[PDB]
Structures are given as structure tokens and as C-alpha cells.
Write a protein that binds this ligand. Sequence first.
Ligand SMILES: *[C@@H]1O[C@H](CO)[C@@H](O[C@@H]2O[C@H](CO)[C@@H](O[C@@H]3O[C@H](CO[C@H]4O[C@H](CO[C@H]5O[C@H](CO)[C@@H](O)[C@H](O)[C@@H]5O[C@H]5O[C@H](CO)[C@@H](O)[C@H](O)[C@@H]5O)[C@@H](O)[C@H](O[C@H]5O[C@H](CO)[C@@H](O)[C@H](O)[C@@H]5O)[C@@H]4O)[C@@H](O)[C@H](O[C@H]4O[C@H](CO)[C@@H](O)[C@H](O)[C@@H]4O[C@H]4O[C@H](CO)[C@@H](O)[C@H](O)[C@@H]4O[C@H]4O[C@H](CO)[C@@H](O)[C@H](O)[C@@H]4O)[C@@H]3O)[C@H](O)[C@H]2NC(C)=O)[C@H](O)[C@H]1NC(C)=O
Ligand SMILES: CCCCCCCC/C=C/CCCCCCCC(=O)O[C@H](COC(=O)CCCCCCCCCCCCCCC)COP(=O)(O)OC[C@@H](O)CO
Ligand SMILES: CCCCCCCC(=O)OC[C@H](COP(=O)(O)O[C@@H]1[C@H](O)[C@H](O)[C@@H](OP(=O)(O)O)[C@H](OP(=O)(O)O)[C@H]1O)OC(=O)CCCCCCC
Ligand SMILES: CCCCCCCC(=O)OC[C@H](COP(=O)(O)O[C@@H]1[C@H](O)[C@H](O)[C@@H](OP(=O)(O)O)[C@H](OP(=O)(O)O)[C@H]1O)OC(=O)CCCCCCC
Ligand SMILES: CCCCCCCCCCCC(=O)OC[C@H](COP(=O)([O-])O)OC(=O)CCCCCCCCCCC
Ligand SMILES: CCCCCCCCCCCCCCCC
Ligand SMILES: CCCCCC
Ligand SMILES: [Cl-]
Ligand SMILES: [Cl-]
Ligand SMILES: [Cl-]
Lengths: 332, 353, 352, 345, 344
Amino acid sequence: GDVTVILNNLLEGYDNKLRPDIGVKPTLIHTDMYVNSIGPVNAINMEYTIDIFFAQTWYDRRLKFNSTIKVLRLNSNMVGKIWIPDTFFRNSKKADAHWITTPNRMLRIWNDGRVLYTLRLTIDAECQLQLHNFPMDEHSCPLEFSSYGYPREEIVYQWKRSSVEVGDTRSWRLYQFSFVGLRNTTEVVKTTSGDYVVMSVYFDLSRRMGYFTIQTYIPCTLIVVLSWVSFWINKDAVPARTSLGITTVLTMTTLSTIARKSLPKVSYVTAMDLFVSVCFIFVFSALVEYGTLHYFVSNRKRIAKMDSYARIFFPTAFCLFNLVYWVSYLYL
Amino acid sequence: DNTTVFTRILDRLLDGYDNRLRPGLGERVTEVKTDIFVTSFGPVSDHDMEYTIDVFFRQSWKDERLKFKGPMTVLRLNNLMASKIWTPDTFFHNGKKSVAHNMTMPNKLLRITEDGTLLYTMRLTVRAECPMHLEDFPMDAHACPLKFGSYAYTRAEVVYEWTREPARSVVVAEDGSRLNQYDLLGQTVDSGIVQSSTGEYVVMTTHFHLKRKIGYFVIQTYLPCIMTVILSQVSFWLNRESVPARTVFGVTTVLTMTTLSISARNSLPKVAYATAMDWFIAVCYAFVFSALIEFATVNYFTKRGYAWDGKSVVPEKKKTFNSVSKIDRLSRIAFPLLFGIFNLVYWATYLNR
Amino acid sequence: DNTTVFTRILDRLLDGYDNRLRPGLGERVTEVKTDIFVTSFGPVSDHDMEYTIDVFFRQSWKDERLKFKGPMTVLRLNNLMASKIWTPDTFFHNGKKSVAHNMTMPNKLLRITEDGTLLYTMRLTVRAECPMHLEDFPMDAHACPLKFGSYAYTRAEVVYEWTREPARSVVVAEDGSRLNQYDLLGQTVDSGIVQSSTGEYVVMTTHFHLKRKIGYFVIQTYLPCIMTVILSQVSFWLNRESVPARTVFGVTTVLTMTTLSISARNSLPKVAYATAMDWFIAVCYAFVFSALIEFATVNYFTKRGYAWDGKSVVPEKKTFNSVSKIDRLSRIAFPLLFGIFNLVYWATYLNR
Amino acid sequence: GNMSFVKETVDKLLKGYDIRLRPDFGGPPVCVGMNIDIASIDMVSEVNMDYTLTMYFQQYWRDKRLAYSGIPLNLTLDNRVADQLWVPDTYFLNDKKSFVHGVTVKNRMIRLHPDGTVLYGLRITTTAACMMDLRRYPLDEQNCTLEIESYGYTTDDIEFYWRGGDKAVTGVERIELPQFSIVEHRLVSRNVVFATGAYPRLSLSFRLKRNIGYFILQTYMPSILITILSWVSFWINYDASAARVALGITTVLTMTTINTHLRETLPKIPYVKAIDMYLMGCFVFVFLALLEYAFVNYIFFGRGPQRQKKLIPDLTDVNAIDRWSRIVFPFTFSLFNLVYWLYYV
Amino acid sequence: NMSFVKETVDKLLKGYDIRLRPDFGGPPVCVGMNIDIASIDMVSEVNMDYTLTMYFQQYWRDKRLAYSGIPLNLTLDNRVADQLWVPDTYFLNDKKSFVHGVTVKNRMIRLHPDGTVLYGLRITTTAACMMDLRRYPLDEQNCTLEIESYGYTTDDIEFYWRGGDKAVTGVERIELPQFSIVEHRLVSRNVVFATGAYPRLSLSFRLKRNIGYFILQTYMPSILITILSWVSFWINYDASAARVALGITTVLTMTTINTHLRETLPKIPYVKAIDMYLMGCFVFVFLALLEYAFVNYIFFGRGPQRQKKLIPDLTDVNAIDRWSRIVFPFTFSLFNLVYWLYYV
Ligand SMILES: *[C@@H]1O[C@H](CO)[C@@H](O[C@@H]2O[C@H](CO)[C@@H](O[C@@H]3O[C@H](CO[C@H]4O[C@H](CO[C@H]5O[C@H](CO)[C@@H](O)[C@H](O)[C@@H]5O[C@H]5O[C@H](CO)[C@@H](O)[C@H](O)[C@@H]5O)[C@@H](O)[C@H](O[C@H]5O[C@H](CO)[C@@H](O)[C@H](O)[C@@H]5O)[C@@H]4O)[C@@H](O)[C@H](O[C@H]4O[C@H](CO)[C@@H](O)[C@H](O)[C@@H]4O[C@H]4O[C@H](CO)[C@@H](O)[C@H](O)[C@@H]4O[C@H]4O[C@H](CO)[C@@H](O)[C@H](O)[C@@H]4O)[C@@H]3O)[C@H](O)[C@H]2NC(C)=O)[C@H](O)[C@H]1NC(C)=O
Ligand SMILES: CCCCCCCC/C=C/CCCCCCCC(=O)O[C@H](COC(=O)CCCCCCCCCCCCCCC)COP(=O)(O)OC[C@@H](O)CO
Ligand SMILES: CCCCCCCC(=O)OC[C@H](COP(=O)(O)O[C@@H]1[C@H](O)[C@H](O)[C@@H](OP(=O)(O)O)[C@H](OP(=O)(O)O)[C@H]1O)OC(=O)CCCCCCC
Ligand SMILES: CCCCCCCC(=O)OC[C@H](COP(=O)(O)O[C@@H]1[C@H](O)[C@H](O)[C@@H](OP(=O)(O)O)[C@H](OP(=O)(O)O)[C@H]1O)OC(=O)CCCCCCC
Ligand SMILES: CCCCCCCCCCCC(=O)OC[C@H](COP(=O)([O-])O)OC(=O)CCCCCCCCCCC
Ligand SMILES: CCCCCCCCCCCCCCCC
Ligand SMILES: CCCCCC
Ligand SMILES: [Cl-]
Ligand SMILES: [Cl-]
Ligand SMILES: [Cl-]
């Protein structure tokens, strides 16, 4: 067969231990990426999952051939026979290729020596998240790659203009986040082994607050509104208003405890913590109001009208705090 | 020895065979006929939006290079020889790290007919994406896909077809069901073409239709909420002077509704929209809070701090006593009727669709 | 050259060697001398009934086919050449999922002496089954076994022995302790024979004796239960007319005891028998209902619905309720009985 | 019994051996006799609907190619020779995950006999699916099976059988599961017809009975004790609304919390279990106990003034209703317990 | 020219013996090492270990691999490392480790004209770190990584840190949500086993836990509940239901908080610093409830006797309540001052 003899001739004398142009010029690699999906963003572990088709193109003069056939299309059989770049992902915690039913790789060789090599990958990549504005936070998660052993004098990577592309984002596994956009960069990173061309893709994600509105904000606001009902009960009903106060305080404590379950153990105040703390202050003040009213009415003996004052003061203060909080955190 | 002829045939089969090239290269398009026997439809994970399925995957094609003649009609090939022969590079487009079983040996088989027809079967456990829209949860239905095709060969090189007609080419075992909270209503089978920067590829798709079973959630969430709402209304029948008791009723029912709402969302993934269960819980919370507000309104108009003594007589409008609240009497009829109407509307709206 | 005799000896060592046959096949029994250095005794999992152990496993035997003569007295074999000779097929009888470390290289070593003595050392992590009887939990003690032997060769083909005296052939490092709620008291070493459908096999056994530490559970379960019991008795000192308050005492203490009972068994396997902690919780539970039933009985005999006003005078036997004599007796009987029960329990369980 | 003679014999046996052909390729089917020694059953899981099982799995078959003479002893060879010999293509049909233990070496045994018999042994741990019917849970009995089949060979090529009959499987009696007790085990041999051709099949089934002791301490006794706690309300005066309401509310909420908490550690099955019936009955009892005081309070404070102006137990007397409840609630609860425990046990 | 480079590389590997170290009969091979820390993932108290991702580089001279005529550092394909001798380095306290393998094995081999070899790996390793949690969460931990040779002794191989104190880099760039790295240290020594001396390198880190999370999680709720318990002192003595409800609720809440805090972490037998604070808060709220119990008993069990017959005084409920009002906040503040001065 014509293809068999061509393949046999190409491999005669080939040494995959050496680059193309080992001592002439750097090997130029053109990279391309199709994003099948961006998996869940694990805020606890500061990582996210991504599934890609990753493609690399370069030139190998040793693989030139003259024939009527202009391109050879090959499965993963010949991948281990020729030189391949040692590309690796710098910020990857765990990555794996796909091997069912066969290895998910493809090779293509043109008559002029151009080699295209593509494979399917699933990568867990670290993404450090600043959660000061949680649950109204936005992040720019990177995905970086470079050659492990070859410095800039030997391998140089490059984007194919419209390199990174995505499919239907509606089918992705993002639930707490919405995909805003992406961008690509290239730079040179200095290490003890030399200087390396590092290429990065940044994905911009914005959190969706709908889950947390149901989980934390609405229950806390409802408990705060429940605490105000004490202002309308008769002051002589000592156990009733005390029961209201302690129930609201305990429920707020429980809500505060469970609000932090999803987050990691950061050591700074998030926007949710401020809201929960302010709700706690308001319910505690509601209980203290009845405490001082009871003490001044009975135990000790404008003060008598404290319930009338509180009926106006507490809802107005709560509304003002909500206005300031939401205006500060959403718009400004 | 009568086995020398078979060894002779097996030895000469791969003389001059190049497994780097597909059969019929440069002459025609390789034709692959596929069929699937689902031995069990595995569990469905809502948190990961993933489902598992264990299958016998069978492919068949023709390779004229591997023709032979002899007394035998079909030759079985071992794993070492099967690795020296071209096979299609099928892969699942929405795969999530499937597994090929290897106990006690690699569970795969290759058979060659004298006319060069290759049959290749394997046993797989495929984990696949099933994206879901949980707006109608827990009364939602899904169509989980399974798409597969060649990775490296475009439609001009390799094409896939179903062995039988597409409806009968995917067979699900009758007893092979591992679903707990789902019912497999049926499946649809189709084929098509997908574009990509590398070219056009043939794709074979199978959709499995699933419907969630509501029985678990009725016991877990709906009935406790209904009982809590009914319990909150029992406070209407107590005397208005029992201020601590009715306050206990209100606060305990509100706390119970809050706890039920918090516990209910633990089953789902953390989606950012309201489901059908969320609306039911919200309406029940509204009813409970309204009952507490009703008690507060009743207490506002109560004059005397003492209840009826037991022996005195109450004339029609000496010691006097509070009257039975008109708000309580109307609430006793208004609250249950409105809750029943809401239940009728909700269950008619969501179950019919 | 200086470094050519070694290459020549290594090349000529394997000529004619068949690694499919054990040394002395059909002539004698292969004797393997074994010893273990435990670098760390891993954590114990009560729920799974297993434990982890990290060891240096050393085996030694004789192979007359591999004797040599040269300037050197001992040779070292790399991983490839080590795979070309016969080695024992030792395995752990009760192992669940073991690991052979190979970072950066395979953590194995093979040495050959000029007389033909082979020494083979490996670094292993073994998860092994330790069945537990938890009747005396959390004051229980266990003897977790570690058993090993040949998988294929019967006693007539391969026999194992300890390199030194059996007590001194298993050495535990002083710093090698990864136990959080256990104390390693010691170990006992032995060997024996086991029958099976394929024949008789030599088995080498080491039992590690462990004793649970009670400090965690004392804080977690016992002290909350004792505080709840003491709390339930405080209601005896309140006046009998405070009906809601004493009812609150009773119901809240009952709920607390129920929650503690439910949460006590969270970190234990689902055994079908009662442990020692269950009896303590049950007795405290009975004490709390005894207090609540006492309050109910006291309330049954209360006549007047009003307490004693601060100004009036109670004549000796407007009238007022007298202090219940059930309360006066219960103020001492309940604490006394609880103290006696604690004395008996902690006496009979701390020296079992 | 010199090593050189054994080396010569072993070299002679493997010279010209064709691994691609079964022992009796032109002849009748080769009979494979299987037996198992169960080492342990580890994790019977209702959440995943499977069980884990570790075993020594041995297969015996006669191969005339490997017959040898002169040497009067059985040759136990190094395990790596298994790759140089034909072995059956046995697999487990209901397997989800399995592997062969590999420390210190691959736990594999090859033994030859003078007549050509080959013993092939493997130490295998397997997770196998077992769909469980939990309607009578925790008073349920489960049947869990392991199916053994040949991947490619029909009955014309390979036959399976349990060698030793009922004694083929060993070690079942020595297993101690904390939550289950093994009541019985059975071996079955048959031929399945999946297509135009019969395939051999072996099946090892166990019947497991769940232990009730854990659940008695965990679920039943707390619910019974909470139900008994509610009846204390009947001994308090009707006018003490705070105490009786607190008692009833506490009991009903605790029952609700127990019922909600219990069911989260199990698969989301759609049907009602036996434990659910008991918890629902207890909930109904405490709810009726609270409604009893609600009815008494309503009767007093909403029909006393009217009856005074106008002027089963007696509906007019609050004390009669309380005493009737005192007599009737324990009796009805005991009757319910009798009917429940007689039905399931 | 590739032909000359190919010829040289073929010459180097021909006759090479992988089974012998670079100077088999000569002095020991000096193997330099350096590390670049990429990340430190979760430090687990439950498992008593930490995970570490690093670029681990080894440096050593091999005369057999020297070449001439090519003024270049030959970075070869990583598969050729299987054809060369490398040190048998391993980690003593490692529990689980692996080399990353995407897109290829993350492995570097580079030769120099003088026979020098640079061998790099990208390793993620979990390493044991037993922690003393007596001062938790105000504690500091010392977590180490030990590096040793499995087979060779000091007469055959020698280890040293390449670059001295600058051997390990990237530590300052590490950030953990829960911990702060205050110091890292390098040590090199020779452990004298019974069979000779073995080289050893050690990389230690000192971690200081951040207190901010626990202040919001445990301390502030406990303080707020304890302050809530004091509100009972301002309620009238005859309102028994309200004061009893306050006391019982606060006591049970403190018990619940302590239990739920202790649900996590391993089952250590000793008392942590957080346990001391929780126990003190429990004692305070319990004393607050016992105060009202004593007041109620004094009133309704001594008033009839005192009337018939006819620190603060024990015969005045108002005096007892006022004394409690003054004393409970002061004692709690003193307890907090003593606690926070001791552990900081
Ligand atoms: C510490 O100890 C560890 C344990 O010992 C050790 O682990 C292992 O390292 C080795 C070497 O580094 C790994 O071997 C590589 O594995 C690749 C596949 O990797 C994936 O799959 C394995 C399981 O693999 C088998 O299964 C796959 C399918 O998954 C099959 O494709 C394979 O053929 C093979 O087959 C059997 O099993 C199947 C069922 O599983 C059966 O269905 C089948 O029929 C077979 O019976 C997984 O374990 C892997 O998981 C791990 O590793 C990744 C990455 O490290 C991790 O991320 C992950 O978490 C896991 O830890 C992974 O999923 C092999 O492809 C590869 O073999 C190729 O290259 C070598 C040369 O380097 C060739 O000699 C070899 O023949 C292979 O390929 C040829 O084929 C390729 C692909 O087609 C061609 O491109 C190439 O040109 C070449 O073709 C030529 O020769 C052929 C010869 O026949 C010829 O046919 C061709 O035509 C052509 O001419 C290699 O084996 C191994 O996976 C690691 N893991 C384990 C568990 O062993 C670790 O290294 C140690 N570390 C240290 C520091 O010491
Ligand atoms: C801890 C609390 C304990 C409370 C317990 C109190 C005791 C009394 C209650 C007994 C509950 C009965 C449980 C019933 C069994 C559980 C529910 C169930 O499985 O029945 C299904 C019908 O559901 C359905 O129609 C869904 C709708 C049923 C909703 C039932 C609630 C009625 C609410 C009316 C409003 C009244 C308000 C009061 C106003 C006065 C049968 O479908 P099918 O086989 O085809 O499977 C197809 C697939 O959907 C899975 O089922
Ligand atoms: C959220 C805000 C809501 C605001 C709601 C505002 C509700 C509102 O307007 O309340 C007034 C009244 C209260 O009635 P209620 O029976 O509770 O109270 C009686 C009423 O105040 C009489 O006027 C009093 O007699 P009098 O005059 O002194 O001789 C009598 O005193 P006494 O004999 O006991 O001494 C009181 O008991 O309610 C209705 O009648 C509406 C029934 C249907 C209401 C709707 C029910 C669903
Ligand atoms: C450890 C238990 C200690 C119990 C030891 C038992 C102690 C014992 O003998 O108490 C008797 C008790 C009621 O005594 P208690 O002091 O509660 O009640 C007084 C008693 O009824 C007097 O007879 C009344 O005086 P009177 O002459 O009518 O004017 C007096 O009325 P007043 O002065 O207010 O006007 C009441 O206060 O009746 C039982 O059946 C107790 C069952 C015990 C069951 C125990 C339940 C656990
Ligand atoms: C291990 C076994 C230990 C048993 C020890 C029992 C000793 C205490 C029993 C009570 C004895 C007693 O009655 O004298 C306490 C004095 C005087 O009481 P009275 O008999 O004159 O009414 O009255 C007082 O001054 C006591 C203070 C009461 C304060 C109220 C709260 C009590 C807390 C109870 C904790 C269980
Ligand atoms: C995506 C925007 C979501 C906006 C919030 C929707 C709330 C819908 C009502 C659900 C309220 C939660 C149940 C009540 C909790 C006490
Ligand atoms: C919205 C609740 C109203 C209650 C009756 C005034
Ligand atoms: Cl997400
Ligand atoms: Cl399911
Ligand atoms: Cl431990």
C-alpha cells in the first residue's frame, strides 16, 4: 500500500527523543481549545473542573513526504512514535485523559510536515477566591499551561487568533455562577530551570444569589419581623414576650451557624456575615426593650410609651439598614 | 494433532497487516453497525446531574484483509491478537470517566467470519451527563441523552448505523432497573451529524425518558408542612386570655416551618431559582405567620387579664368578663377553607401538567 | 577496567536461571526468615472495624543457583533484575487494601550474598481487619491481628520463620504512633498452621493490644447527661404553684436526654447489643422521668391555685398550700440514688 | 526429584503450547469446576444497593497438553505462568467494581497435576449489586446473589459445575455481620438462553435477616417514651393552659423531628416502610393528645357561659373527658402496638 | 545540526549500564536537591496530614554522560529517564503521592556537556503531621517532610540542599484560608542506623492558626448567650415561668453549642482551649439559673417561717438580685481577661 510505505519511510531514522530543529531555532506550537463544559466551582477546595478538547499544531521537517496523498489522518496508534510537546497545566491539581473505548487522541500529518495533535482532557484547576463580597462576588479563574522541560529558547507556544471557543453554556454544570466571558494571555515566567512561555485563559464568573436569598436572607428577615410582634403584645404577659425574645435569639443563632456551611473557613467578614450580625443586633435589642420596659414598669416601681416608640423605630431602622446595605453592595 | 491447522490459519492472518490504516482506506467509507444492550439503568444523581448505565456495546464492520478459508466458519480472537487489528475509536461525547470491566479477564470479545466480517463486543459502565431543569421539582421529568461517535475519523472516513431499525437497536433488560426515585418510561433513538473545527462527524444519540416518583417527598416535606399549618390553626379554639399558650403555638409553628424549609433544600443541588416545593413552603409559611398575626390582633383588643371564673353568668352586651373574639370565630372558618382551596389549586396545577 | 567484573558477574548470574521454580524444588523445603519494623501504627476505624499500619517488611532465604565468586562480598539488584528471579509470594490473610510505595522509585531492595543468601526488603502500608466486641464500650480493649503467609506454596514447600525470637522479631518505633483514641500496650507474636481446601499453610501472626481512651467520651456524652440529670432535680426546690415552670423543666430535660441518646451512637457501628454507655444513658433517662412523674404526683395533690403572698401569715396545722412532703423527701433521695448509681457503675466498669 | 529434571519437564510442557486454543478445542466441552472460600462480607449498603465480598476463587479444569509423568508430586508454579496458559473467560454478571489483591505480589495460584489437571486460584474482592425491598424495613429479609458466567463460550465449549456439591462454598458460617445474620446460602447451576445458544451460569445466593436490636434502642424506645410523656397532660388541671400546651407542642414537634431525621440516611424510595408506619402512629397519638386539651379548653371557655345562661364520657364535664382519656389512651396505644408487632414479626 | 546531535546522543547511551551508580568504586555521588512549592492544599486535623504540590529537582554529575562539540544543554524527552541511573529518593512520612501525567509524564531530564544531569519531577504528596491540639484554636503546628535514600548509605550517596537556605522557594506565595506560614527551615544530617549512616534532608514549616473564623463561629455566640442569661436578673421574682424559661433555654443552648463544636475534629482525649471557654460559659449560665432557683426557694420556703417568728443578706430576694446584677458581668469580664491573657 502507498500509505504503508510512506509511514514506514517516515519512521526510518526518526529519533523521538529530539525536537524538530533541535539546535537551529525554537519549535513554534499553535494551541487551540474547545470547552465542552466548566464543571462545578468547589469554593471549599478553591478549585473548579473543566472538560476540553486541547489541540496543538507544529512543524516537523522529518515528517515531510511527497505523494498524491496530501494528508494522513491517524488515530492514537502513532502518537507514541513521534516527538510530542511536553505540555502541562501549571495550576492543575488533578488532570486525566479519556481511554474509553480507546484513547481519545487524534493525529494528522500533512505533506509539508505540519502535525496536528488533539486530545480530550478533564482538569481540576485551582482558583483562589476572594469572598469579601460573598454572595455578591465575582471571580476570574485561570487555566495556565506551558512546557515542562523546554525553556523559551526551545519551545514557544502561540494562540490561533480565535483560539478558545465554547459551545452551549446552558448545558454546563455551573449552578451558583454564571459565565460572563473569557480572555487569553501569554507571558514569560522565570524559574530555577530557566524562562518558560506560559499561556493562560481567564474565565470570568459571577455568582447567582438566588439560592442564598432563599436560604439565608428571607428566613433572617422573617425572624426579625417576628421579633417585632412582641411590641404589640400586652406588657403584663411576661412569659409570652420572653418566649418570643428567646425563640428569635436562638433561631438567629442557628441561622448564623448554618449560613457558613457552604463557605470555607476564611478569617474575614463577608457581606452575609454583616447582614446576619445586624439581624442579631436587632432581635437582641427587641428583647432588651421589653426587659427595660418591664423593669421600669413593675420591678423598679416617656418610659411607658416605649412600645409605641418601638413600633415606629424598629421597622424604619430595619428598612434604612436594608436600603444602605443593598445600595452599597449592589451598585457601589 | 488436529489443532495445527488452526494455529497455521491464525499465524498467517496478520501477514502484511497494517493496523494503523482503517479498512477500505482510499476506496470507500468504513461502515460500522452498532447496537446496545442495557443490562441495568443505574442510579441517577441529581446533585451531579449524572446517570450511570451498564451496557453490552456491540459493533460490527468488514475488513477484507482478514479473510480466510477453512473448515471453520468463525474464528475467536484473544486480547493479544485483537490489539493488533484496527477497531473503531468510538467514544461517548457526554462521557464522565466510564469504566471497562476487567474481572477475571478483559470483558471483551472479537470474532471474525470467513468473509471478513468483524464483530466486537465489550461490557462497559458509562457515567453520562443529564442536565436538568428543576423548576417543576419534585414533579419534573427529564430526557437524559447518550451520544457517541468516532473521535478521529470524520464522516468521509467512518460512518455509524444501527444494526436493526433505530427503535429496536437499543434493548433494555426487563429486570435491569436500579432506579429508586425514577421511572424509565421509554427511549428514543436517532442519528445525525455534528460540525467542529476539525470537520463533520457522525453522532449516534439515545434519549432515555425519566419521571420522578413523588412518594418520598410527600412523606418527607409536604405532610409535615400540612400538619404544621393545621396545628397553627388549633390556636384559634383556645380562650383569648391564654396569652402564653397561643404565643407558644405561633412561635413553635413558625420555627417548625423554618426548619422544614431549611431541611427541604438539602436534597437538591444549590440551584438559583425557586422550585414547586418552594412555593408550597412559602404559602404554608404565610399561613402560619398569618395565624400568629391573627392572635396578635385578637390580643390587642382583649381588655381583662383574667379568664372566665366558671360560676358567674355573662349577660348580653359586678365583675365582668371578656367576650369571645369575633376575629377568632371568623378565622376558624376562613383559614381552613382558604388552605383547602390553595391545596386544590396547587395540586390541580402541578399534577395535570 | 575496575567496573567490568561487576557487570560480568551480573550478566552471568542469570544464565540458565528459571524463576518459575522455587529454590530446592523437589529436594527440600524453602525456609524464609521474616521480620517487621513498624514505622507507624496507623489510625483505627471503629466504624469499618479495621486499622492501618506502615511497615518495613524484611524476608530472607537461600538460593544456591545465585551464588558467585568475586572481589565483592555482596551485590545489589535493581528492580528489573529483582523481577527476573524467584521471590516468595507472601500475602496478608486479613488485609483489605494494601499499597506498595514507589515514590520516587520502587521502595524495594534486593541484596545477594556470595554464598547465595537473598535479602529482600519492602516498604508497605496495610489496611487490616480488626473485628471488635463493643459490649464494654467506651471502656473496651481489643487485640487486632496481622496474619501473613504464602498464597500458593503449602507447608511441604515453603515455611516461614522469625529472624530472631518471636517477641523481638517485630519492632515498633518509639515515635511511630498515629493513634488518637487508643493506647498501644504491646504485641504478641506467634505462628501456626491453617487448613484449607488446597492444603495446609504456615501462617505468621502478630496481635497488637489496644486500649481505648475514655477522655473524649467523658466530655462528649457523660458530662452532658450528668448535668441534665442534676438540672432535672432543681425543679424540686421550686414552689408547687409554679405549674408551667416545673413542666418546662420536665419536658426540656426529657428532650435533652432523648437528643443525647440519639447522638451518642453516631460514631459507632450499628451493633445489635447494648454497650456500657447505653446503660448509663438509660439510667439517666429513667431518673429524668422519675423527676417529672414526681412533679405530676405533687401537682395532683395541690388544692389552691395561688402561691403564698409575701405579706400574709400561714397558721400552723385565707389559707395557703403547705410545702409538699414529696418534694422534701425527693430533694435528698434523688441525688443520693444518683450518686450511689454512679459509684457502682464507675466501680464495676473501670476495673473490668 | 532433581530441579534439572523438573526444569526439563516444565520447558517441554510449554514448548509449542498455543494459548489461543482451549484444552479440547476440537473435542467435547471442557468442564470447569469452581469453588469459593468466603473470607468476609464487609459493607451491605442500602444507600448504594450493593454488598462487598472478599473470597478465594478457585477453578479446576483438565488440560491434556499439560500432562506430565515421572515427577510424582503436584507442581505449584510461579503465578506469572498464568499469562502463558489458557484460562476460562469467567466473569461476574452483577459486578460493579472488583479487583485482585496485589501485595506483596499478585495473589494468584497456578498448580499442575500429573494427569493434566490445572488449579487456578485468585483472591478477589467484589462489589455486587443487590436490589433490596425495604417495605418491611427494619424487619426485612434480603436475598443477595453473585452470578458467574462465561463471556464468550457457550455450552458447546465450556461447562460449569460446583465441585463438591453443596460443600463447594466454604466459610459462610464464620462470617459475623454487625447488622445482619446469614440465615441460609444456596448454590445453583443452570444454562441461560440469551440467544441461539445456551450459556453456563452459576449462582451463589445468601439470605440475610436484619438485626432489630439497634433499631429498638435508636427509634422505637424514644418514640414510645415520647408518646408516654404526652399522657402526663391528662393529669393536669384544665385551667393550666401553658403547661398542657407546652407538653403537647413539645411532644408533637419532637415526633416530627425524629421522623424527619430518621429517613435521611436511606435511599429516596417512594413507598412507606414499617418504621414509617410506627412513627406515623406515634405522631397521630401525640397529635390527638394535644387536640384533647384543645377540645376541653374550647368546651369549657366556649360553652360554659352559654350553658349557664341557658340554665364515651359526658361531653359537658371537662373532668370526665380527662379521666376517659387517662383510661383510653394507654389502652389504645397498647392495642396498636399489639397489632403492629403481630403483623410484622 | 541534528545529525551530529543524534550521533552524540546515540554514543552516550551505547554501553551505558543502568545498574551501576556514576562512580561505582569511587567516592559517593553528591546529589543536590531543590524544591519549588506550587501549593499547599488542605491541612487536615481529622486525618493529621497535609498535601503538598511541588517541583522536586535533583542534580548530580555522571562522567559517562559527558559530551563535547555541542555547546548546548540537551533537554531530552522525558522517556529517556528510564534508560539512565537516578537516585532512589523517597519520603519517610509520605502516605500517598503521585507524579502528574497530563499531557505527558511531568518529568524533565537535561544533560550538560560536563556530564551533569538535572532531573525534575512534579509531585503531589500527602504527608503525615501529628498535631498537638491542646491550645486549639490558638495553637501552632510544625509539619515536616523528610527525604531519604532507600538503599544507599553515606559511603555511596550524599545529599545536600542546592543553594543553601535558598534551596526551597515559593513558600511566601502560599496562602491558606485557615493558616499562616510564619517560618520554614531546612536541615541536612546523617541518621546513624545500625547498618551505617544514611543521608537525610528535612523541610519543616511552622503554621499559625487564624483566630478570626472562630471568633465569629464560637466565641461571640457564647458571649451573647451568656449575656442573655443575665436578663433574668432584671425580671420580677414572682414571674417564675419567664426566668425559668430563660435559664433552661440558655443552659441547653450552651450544651448544644459545645456538642456541635466537638462533632468535628478527631476524638482526642484531652481538653482543648475552646473547651475551657465553653465550660466556663456553661458554668456561668448554670449559676445564673441556680440563682433564681435559690431566690424562689428562699422566698417560698422562708417567708412563712420568717413572718411567723417575727456578700448580700440571704433574706432579701431584691438584694440577691441586685448583687447578681453587679457581680455576674464583673466576674465574666475577669474570666475573659484571665483566659485571653493566658492563651495569647
Ligand atoms: C508507581 O506505581 C504505579 C503502579 O505500578 C505506576 O503506574 C502506572 O504507570 C504506567 C507507566 O507510566 C502506566 O502505563 C501507561 O498507562 C496508559 C493508560 O493509562 C490509563 O489506563 C490505565 C489502565 O490501563 C490499561 O488500560 C487502558 C485503558 O484505561 C488501556 O488503554 C491499556 O492498553 C491498558 O490495557 C488493559 O486494561 C484495560 C482495562 O483497564 C483492558 O480493557 C485492556 O484490554 C487492557 O487489558 C489506568 O490505570 C491509568 O490511570 C492512571 O494514570 C493516569 C496518568 O498517570 C493518572 O492520571 C490516573 O489517575 C491513574 O493513576 C490511565 O487511566 C497506557 O496507554 C500506557 O501504555 C503506552 O505507552 C507505552 C510506552 O510508554 C507503550 O509501551 C504501551 O504499549 C502503551 O502504548 C502504545 O500505545 C499508545 C496508545 O495507543 C500509542 O500512542 C503508542 O504509540 C504505543 O503504540 C505502540 O505500541 C503498542 C504495543 O502493543 C502497539 O500496539 C501500537 O500499535 C504502537 O505500535 C502505559 O501503560 C499505568 O497506567 C500507570 N497506572 C497503573 C495503575 O499501572 C506508576 O507509574 C509508578 N510511579 C512511579 C513514579 O514509579
Ligand atoms: C410527620 C407527619 C405525619 C403525618 C401523618 C398523618 C397520618 C395520615 C397521613 C397519611 C399519609 C398517607 C401517605 C400516602 C403515601 C405517600 C404518597 C404516595 O406515594 O401516593 C402516590 C400519590 O401521591 C399523590 O397523589 C400526590 C398528591 C398527594 C398529596 C396528599 C396531601 C393532601 C393534602 C390535602 C390538603 C388538606 C389541608 C387541610 C384542609 C382542611 C401514589 O402514586 P403512584 O402509586 O401512582 O406512584 C407514582 C409516583 O408518583 C410515586 O408514587
Ligand atoms: C393586620 C392588621 C389587621 C387589623 C384588623 C382589625 C380588626 C378589628 O377591627 O378589630 C375590631 C373587632 C374586634 O372584635 P373582638 O371580638 O376581638 O373584640 C370585641 C370588640 O372590641 C368589642 O367592640 C368590645 O366590646 P365594646 O365595644 O367595648 O362594648 C369587646 O369587649 P368585651 O366585651 O370583651 O369587653 C371585644 O371583645 O374585630 C371585628 O369585629 C372584626 C371581625 C372580622 C375581622 C377579620 C377576621 C378574619
Ligand atoms: C421519693 C418519693 C417520696 C414520696 C413519699 C410520700 C410522702 C407522702 O406521704 O406524701 C403524701 C402524698 C401527698 O402529700 P403532699 O405533701 O404532697 O400533700 C399534702 C397532703 O395531701 C395533706 O394531706 C394535705 O393536708 P390536709 O390534711 O388534707 O389538710 C396537704 O394540703 P394543704 O396543707 O396544702 O392544705 C397537702 O399539701 O400523697 C401521696 O399519695 C404521695 C404518693 C408518693 C408517690 C411518689 C412519686 C414518685
Ligand atoms: C452525692 C450525694 C449528695 C447528696 C447531698 C444532699 C445535700 C443537700 C440536700 C438538701 C438538704 C437540705 O434540705 O438542706 C438544705 C438547706 C435547708 O433545707 P431545709 O430542709 O431546711 O428546707 O437549704 C439550702 O440552703 C440549700 C440550697 C438550695 C438552693 C436551691 C438549688 C439547689 C440545687 C439542687 C442541685 C441538685
Ligand atoms: C432567582 C430569584 C429568586 C428570588 C427569590 C424567590 C423566592 C421565592 C419564594 C421562596 C421563599 C423560600 C421559602 C420560605 C422560607 C421561610
Ligand atoms: C393577614 C392576617 C389577618 C388576620 C386577621 C386580622
Ligand atoms: Cl457551581
Ligand atoms: Cl434513582
Ligand atoms: Cl485512633
